[PDB]
């Protein structure tokens, strides 16, 4: 399975970190 964000925004990404990281652009920083 494709690490998917799905804020809708769904970058697909490879990596959980890439994920992750991305994730802190919605969420986990201000
Ligand atoms: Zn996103």
Same mark, same amino acid.
């Given at each position: 399975?494709? +690490?998917?964000?799905?804020?809708?925004?769904?970058? /697909? +990404?490879? /990596?959980?970190?890439?994920?992750? /990281?991305?994730? /802190?652009?919605?969420?986990?920083?201000?």
């Amino acid at each position: 399975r494709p +690490f998917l964000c799905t804020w809708a925004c769904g970058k /697909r +990404f490879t /990596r959980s970190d890439e994920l992750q /990281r991305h994730k /802190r652009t919605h969420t986990g920083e201000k």
